[PDB]
């Protein structure tokens, strides 16, 4: 073929219709606003392309096969790389002044950011749960989409999410077997014994101002480290939304996290890293978007009532962090010797 | 002289003393931790060097002289550039694993993060207020310091801060004069007349859901826009800490913000931009530091039974933003034609 | 009005046709290759949109009017910001392996990067010159285009380029007037007297190997500074292509460069800076692209009998630098006191 | 200990002596110039710390042991990360104007950028050879040093470089054994038969314009792919300096490069990638340092009538790229099916 025809530039480079130009008063900066979003949507399409291919590798149940595992890790890293660029893409819109923006703002109404199907699909496919999704202007997230788009968005809710699939894989981690290696058993013993060593040692220190603080630190460290073995706490925190992964998935995640230097757990750890990197960048994107909406509209300007800036500020939270459990693995790090070994 | 002697490399490259190596068990990654902090401290010294030079240009009262104004804007931009790099410097410490970090963590005690004199001076010299700051372990920030350091740290609180100096400059903005150009007067009249025209436009509009939805938004925006002309409200918000700049400073800031395209207001706006950039990057530094402490240490782990991650997450707030008023200027943007004519 | 309809997502998100998928054997990484180029082309469209608006502000002859000058500087800075991002966009294609790329490479032929109309227009509108443009496999860039495209590409060559327009503006700089301020005169005298004083200073020093180093450097710098006032040398370098701006434009550029701290020359300098940034980033884009063609195809693999990597290596040079004269202004920097004082 | 004492800030933050201030006329921007270099030198110290630890892991001969292999790959990646930041650090010095720079430039003489011991050690320890070093003002790089420094710089030349150590490791790659798996044998046969099959499809009537260029390209590709198996050519290119790795090392590198998707060759490939990244970033550092030396003092000025810019422009070349052979692995890229099948050997 020919470059332009292969890339369908007859469609791509003929999709720029300025509403200010259509309504007479053509505003120059409107073209930047069009291109920016079109670039974002092209990248969301690519993110979904990678995400759906990764999801299907899991659905086949052959993720553990080293060749398929690499495809997952690499494509997950790619999404991380795309998102990294997408955060930097805000710097283009920083060149647009608040004044020049408002010259065309009026022509954009009533079109909303909530009408970005690709962003919504991307959120749903990762594992952003609808139940613990903050509602704007007493209106639900799916009311903006009314048609074949609503049908496609329902599929993303129903179908197995990336979190659901990663949970499944984490549950099947070798070494968790109580009759086999028994990681959870061995760990509980070394930790309880490690803390007994620690409590007596913080007591075998001179009665200073530092001790009333260290004793109180112990009651919270001991609480955190042992609550790991309390399954009822885990089941209560899951219902609240404070935890996403199942108890067995959490055990698998901790195993990979501790044995990250081991050859068998290097690549599974890389995947966990990529899942955390995707979540951090999804947050940085939301944060950089919040700043953009504050610079252009203000902390009070919204849609027929409540400010848009205050709804979006509540989306830049740990509730929107799908792989929140993976971030909390670091709260349970124990000295190297306390980790059960091998022969 | 000679490269090494000029750069005093006999001091710089002979300041790396590994505590794990001193206490026998040498940990390799400890050297990375030393170098990173030494690089940060060199950059904080440079930030303070620029900041103090900018502060003294203001103190002389000749900041309005175009030649001195350029020195300020350029040096303020430089601080923005240094901070941009310091945020990126976290990526170096991302190469250190949580496991390898804990191997030397023990040797670091009792040295703390808020024992960094340069960072504290940097906060104080910008205008981070002592009353408007969150305490860790019910202790003050100055209690960790003693002697000559505590003496130097009190000077930064007492002496005129960058905010105090910018406020002073903003108060002396030409055009605010009520018998001169009378910007504030002209503005208030234009906003009243503007809202009136906007109202009869919404009133004559065909009675719908969007007609009543627009009335609710009009009433909220009308309230907001005229709240700007209530000086006692401003005075009450200043005491609460919700605002930092004086009422006359806020008027000057709004003048530069609206007339940013004017030749007389391009450079003063660049300064306001750089000040906002500094505040944004100071936040991004705090945020990137809190992501580092959440994956190196725990969400509950800290010093003396305290927050740790939770305290450093309360610093990543608008209360630590010194130039908060400058960010809120956007919440008062009015259509281009409502802005009073300059000539 | 709806988001998708406003942004014409029915066109944009329905323009992804994988050739490997069309020919059966669907290659996954091909979709990344499509999206990447489509993103690049959307950004080239935006760069051209800004560039053409800047060019028309100049063509009206009212660029010296501070309000129009700001529009130019700001939009030129925006192009710099867009280019900065496109350089970083190569990092996306770094995730694609050489192996996975060759699985679909076959399905792309005979389509070439030389068929990117927008990139060619972008080069021509800035002021990349055809006569001093390296030819690939004994074939000119315009041979790869036909019809309406070839007609539109001819217009970009004929019409006033950004360089031609900036040159025009630089020629009309106040202070160059020999009967007025006479900058070039004052500068020539001052550089002569300055070098004389600097010579007394080096000569009165103690005879050592440090003195002979300062001598050889003074002699070299004396040659460079005095060669600036040689207009025929400039005229000869212009014909060779080693310089692009006219002698009077070069004088205006030096004036802005020295008086950059002055209120009247702050914004004109910002423009000069922006142009240099655009040239630097256009080079960094070419460099980051030649580093991808090497990694994906190799040092010797080309289209015809010629090497792809070797040709693209010849574009990452100073001949493709439109604003090359602006980069060389630093070679003529003189001590602050040698600079002629300003008239109030 | 206390933060300041642990980090020896009494040394670090008391090492800033402005020469313009010492000679009366204090220039503000001089402090930026001091801090920038001090930051660079701290990072060069850290790069050397990682580099020397990586070099000793190789010298022990236990680099193939998966646990030690990871230490190497990770620390090599860290150097890549530090260098990435060092390239971005030039943006700090971009805030300094050419005019403000020249106000203090005079006070810096006769100190030179060549007097950076750490940078020289870093170059020598990687594998930048003295035989292929471009000379400035007809003065060798070692002449700018004296005493203990000159003694320490000689050690870096003598001792096994990172290239020498990587070459050694590449030579011992499993599968190269002619009686074992015999990769080079299998590969040679497959490339010959592969080229034959392509020639039969090309030479199959349709004498057009496109067909002749396709013959010209086949003939050029056939030449390059076959010249790979000519060990005589390789040893001639090694003596010229156009290649750095030994013929057996090149074979090992190609094996990892083709079998990169294999579980046994994932981590060795990551190392090769990190080595190439280090080489790319070392170049980007030199290039960004060339742009800066052009913006300040121009393109003609330097030392003793010799151009500073022009010399640093000649260091941006492929001659300074130590792992140049690794970059050229992409030139001998063959269709997936031509690559020999992996059997347990
Ligand atoms: C001029 C800059 C921008 C402004 C002022 C802006 C404003 C807003 C506002 C006010 C909202 C809340 C919903 C609404 O009324 O639309 C929103 C939502 C959103 N915006 Fe933007 N936006 C901007 C740029 C972007 C860009 C460049 C993208 C990328 C495609 C984007 C994607 C979205 C998405 C996906 C949402 C829904 C977010 C969520 O529910 O979590 N916006 N935007
Ligand atoms: C391994 C990575 C790091 C960890 C785990 C870490 C941990 C902490 C912790 C827990 C705190 C709270 C106070 C304390 O107990 O010390 C803190 C404070 C602080 N850290 Fe670090 N830190 C790290 C890296 C850095 C770096 C690279 C710098 C730069 C010099 C830095 C500068 C500071 C400063 C200035 C504070 C006081 C912050 C405030 O009060 O707002 N930290 N750090
Ligand atoms: C897989 C990565 C890429 C490879 C291997 C590649 C390869 C090449 C090659 C070999 C050429 C020489 C002409 C030809 O045969 O096409 C070329 C030219 C070109 N490529 Fe690419 N390219 C890549 C990515 C890109 C991207 C992402 C863009 C951005 C749109 C791009 C834009 C161009 C342009 C505009 C030219 C003409 C350059 C000139 O004449 O100065 N290429 N590319
Ligand atoms: C104001 C910016 C700078 C200028 C004008 C500058 C100029 C130069 C010049 C002219 C040379 C050639 C030798 C000489 O006469 O010194 C050189 C060499 C060098 N510079 Fe700089 N330099 C600058 C910044 C830096 C920085 C920030 C570093 C980092 C430490 C650096 C490191 C070096 C090194 C290591 C060399 C030797 C390079 C080689 O032989 O390959 N320079 N510099
Ligand atoms: O409703 C939004 C108000 O601010 C301006 C953009 C408005 C809206 C919008 C309309 C058309 C095309 C894109 C976008 C967009 C992205 N994020 C929010 N949106
Ligand atoms: O208190 C911190 C707990 O985590 C480990 C580092 C601890 C502390 C620390 C000890 C020694 C030298 C520097 C620093 C530093 C900077 N920011 C935090 N720190
Ligand atoms: O001719 C190029 C050889 O390498 C593969 C891509 C080939 C060509 C190509 C074909 C189709 C779509 C885009 C591109 C592109 C960008 N820069 C070069 N190209
Ligand atoms: O030789 C260089 C000419 O330009 C000014 C700096 C000169 C020289 C220099 C003097 C003192 C301290 C550091 C450096 C350095 C690093 N790279 C170049 N330099």
Pocket of ligand 1 (CB under 6 A): A 36-37, 40, 93, 101, 112-114, 116, 119, 289, 292-293, 296-297, 303, 308, 312, 315
The whole-angstrom distance between B60's CA and the closest CA on chain A is: 33
Cα(B290)–Cα(B278) distance, integer angstroms = 18
Q: How far is CA C262 from the centre of its chain?
A: 26
Evaluate: CB of D66 within 6 angstroms of ligand 6.
no
Nearest to A87 by CA among C74, B310, B284: B284
What letter does residue C306 receive in the DSSP assignment? S
Cα(A201)–Cα(A224) distance, integer angstroms = 19
Nearest to C325 by CA among C246, C266, C270: C246
Question: Taking CB atoms and an 8 Å limit, are B13 and D42 in contact across chains?
Answer: yes
Cα separations (Å) of C213 from B294, D43, D57, D105, D110?
A: 57, 32, 45, 16, 10
| Burial bucket for residue D267 (CB in 10 Å: 0-12, 13-18, 19+) | middle
Q: Count the helices and strands in chain B (H runs, E runs).
A: 17, 0
Evaluate: CB of B113 within 6 angstroms of ligand 6.
yes
SS3 B262: coil
Evaluate: CB of A6 within 6 angstroms of ligand 7.
yes
Name the token pair of D319. Answer: 């001659």
Cα(D21)–Cα(B88) distance, integer angstroms = 32
Residue of B1, B3, B89 with shortest CB distance to D116: B3
CB-based contacts of D223: which residues, under 8 Å, 6+ apart?
A: none
**Number of Cα atoms under 13 Å in the Cβ half of residue B241:** 13
User: For residues D293 and D311, is the Cβ–Cβ distance under 8 A?
Assistant: no
Residue having the nearest C-alpha atom to atom 18 of ligand 6? B113
Chain D adjacent subunits, 3+ CB pairs under 8 A: A, B, C
Chain C adjacent subunits, 3+ CB pairs under 8 A: A, B, D
Cα separations (Å) of C141 from A161, C113, C289, C319?
A: 49, 10, 18, 16
User: For residues D125 and D161, is the Cβ–Cβ distance under 8 A?
Assistant: yes
* DSSP H helical ranges for chain C: 3-6, 9-12, 19-22, 30-59, 66-88, 90-93, 98-108, 117-126, 148-158, 162-171, 183-203, 211-226, 231-240, 247-258, 266-297, 308-315, 324-327
Residue of B66, B70, B266 with shortest CB distance to C70: B266
* A33 appears as a binding residue in the annotation: yes
| Residues of chain A positioned with their CB less than 8 A from the CB of D67 | 261
Cα separations (Å) of A30 from A88, A91, A96, B257, C73?
A: 20, 16, 9, 21, 18
The whole-angstrom distance between B76's CA and the closest CA on chain C is: 16
User: For residues C37 and C15, is the Cβ–Cβ distance under 8 A?
Assistant: no
Cα separations (Å) of B63 from B49, C311, D26?
A: 18, 53, 21
- Provide DSSP, A132-145: T---BTTB-TTSS-
Cα(B188)–Cα(B184) distance, integer angstroms = 6
Question: What chain A residue is nearest to D263 in terms of C-alpha separation?
Answer: A66
Nearest to A130 by CA among A100, A103, A153: A153
Question: Taking CB atoms and an 8 Å limit, are D35 and B19 in contact across chains?
Answer: no
Does D110 sit behind a cis peptide bond, omega within 30 degrees of 0 on the bond before it?
A: yes
Question: Which technique?
Answer: X-ray
User: For residues B29 and B101, is the Cβ–Cβ distance under 8 A?
Assistant: yes
CB-based contacts of C287: which residues, under 8 Å, 6+ apart?
A: C316
Residue having the nearest C-alpha atom to atom 15 of ligand 7? C113
Binding site residue list of D for substrate:
33-37, 105, 303
- Provide DSSP, C119-184: HHHHHHHHT--STTSPPSSS--GGGG--THHHHHHHHHHHSPPHHHHHHHHHHT-TT--TTTT-HH
Resolution in A: 3.2
Name the token pair of B53. Answer: 């030079």
* D307, β-bridge pairs: D302
Q: How far is the CA of A45 from the centre of ligand 5 (A)?
A: 19
Nearest to D169 by CA among D76, D78, D80, D283: D76
All structural domains of chain A: 3-176+243-338 (1.20.58.480)
Cα(C18)–Cα(C28) distance, integer angstroms = 9
Nearest to A276 by CA among A284, A264, A265, A287: A284
Neighbours of B138 (CB within 10 A): 7
Residues preceding gaps in chain D (C to N > 2.5 Å): none
Cα(A282)–Cα(C217) distance, integer angstroms = 56
Q: What ligand 8 atom has the least distance to the C-alpha of D296?
A: 4
Q: How far is CA B90 from the centre of its chain?
A: 19
Name the token pair of B156. Answer: 């930064």
CB-based contacts of A30: which residues, under 8 Å, 6+ apart?
A: A18, A19, A20, A21, A104, A107
Cα(A334)–Cα(D199) distance, integer angstroms = 64
| Residues of chain D positioned with their CB less than 8 A from the CB of A260 | none
Residue of B7, B85, B111 with shortest CB distance to D89: B85
Does A85 sit behind a cis peptide bond, omega within 30 degrees of 0 on the bond before it?
A: no
| Residues of chain C positioned with their CB less than 8 A from the CB of D296 | 330
Cα(A97)–Cα(A29) distance, integer angstroms = 9
Cα separations (Å) of C75 from B164, C52, C83, D236?
A: 34, 10, 12, 54
Residue having the nearest C-alpha atom to atom 6 of ligand 3? C293
Question: What chain B residue is nearest to A102 in terms of C-alpha separation?
Answer: B335
SS3 B139: strand
Question: Taking CB atoms and an 8 Å limit, are A46 and C53 in contact across chains?
Answer: no
Nearest to B289 by CA among B305, B312, B310, B307: B312
Nearest to C86 by CA among C233, C274, C286, C262: C286
User: For residues B223 and B191, is the Cβ–Cβ distance under 8 A?
Assistant: no
Element holding D303 (H helix, E strand): strand D302-303
Question: Taking CB atoms and an 8 Å limit, are A17 and C9 in contact across chains?
Answer: no
Q: How far is the CA of B83 from the centre of ligand 4 (A)?
A: 24
Rg of chain D on CA atoms, in Å: 25
| Residues of chain B positioned with their CB less than 8 A from the CB of A305 | 213, 216-217, 220
Counting other chains too, the contacts that A20-25 makes at CB distance below 8 Å and 24 or more residues apart are A20/A103, A20/A104, A20/A107, A22/A107, A23/A107
Q: How far is CA C290 from the centre of its chain?
A: 17
What letter does residue B71 receive in the DSSP assignment? H
Neighbours of B178 (CB within 10 A): 9
Q: What ligand 4 atom has the least distance to the C-alpha of D111?
A: 16
Best probe residue, ligand 6, of B22, B102, B112 (max atoms within 8 Å of C-beta): B112
């Amino acid at each position: 073929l020919i470059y332009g025809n292969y890339l369908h530039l007859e469609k791509v480079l003929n999709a720029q219709e300025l509403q200010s130009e259509t309504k007479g008063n053509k505003i120059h900066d409107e073209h930047l606003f069009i291109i920016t979003h079109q670039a974002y949507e092209l990248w969301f399409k690519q993110i979904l392309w990678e995400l759906d291919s990764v999801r299907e590798i899991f659905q086949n149940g052959h993720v553990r096969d080293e060749r398929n595992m690499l495809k997952v890790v690499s494509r997950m890293h790619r999404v991380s790389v795309i998102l990294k660029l997408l955060v930097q893409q805000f710097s283009i819109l920083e060149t647009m002044t608040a004044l020049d923006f408002n010259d065309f703002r009026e022509y954009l109404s009533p079109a909303s950011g909530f009408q970005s199907l690709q962003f919504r699909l991307l959120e749903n496919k990762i594992g952003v749960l609808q139940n613990m999704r903050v509602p704007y202007n007493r209106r639900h997230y799916r009311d903006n989409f009314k048609g074949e788009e609503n049908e496609l968005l329902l599929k993303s809710e129903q179908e197995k999410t990336l979190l659901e699939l990663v949970e499944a894989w984490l549950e099947r981690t070798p070494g968790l077997e109580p009759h086999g290696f028994n990681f959870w058993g061995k760990l509980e013993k070394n930790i309880t014994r490690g803390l007994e060593e620690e409590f007596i040692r913080i007591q075998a220190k001179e009665e200073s101002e530092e001790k009333e603080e260290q004793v109180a630190e112990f009651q919270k460290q001991k609480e955190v480290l042992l609550s790991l073995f309390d399954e009822k706490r885990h089941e209560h925190l899951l219902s609240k939304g404070e935890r996403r992964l199942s108890y067995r998935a959490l055990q698998g995640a901790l195993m990979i996290y501790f044995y990250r230097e081991e050859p068998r757990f290097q690549v599974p750890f890389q995947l966990l890293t990529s899942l955390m990197d995707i979540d951090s960048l999804m947050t940085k994107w939301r944060y950089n978007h919040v700043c953009m909406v504050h610079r252009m509209l203000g902390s009070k300007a919204g849609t027929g009532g409540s400010s848009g800036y205050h709804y979006l500020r509540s989306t830049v939270s740990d509730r929107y962090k799908v792989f929140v459990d993976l971030f909390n693995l670091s709260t349970y790090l124990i000295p190297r010797h306390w980790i059960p070994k091998m022969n």
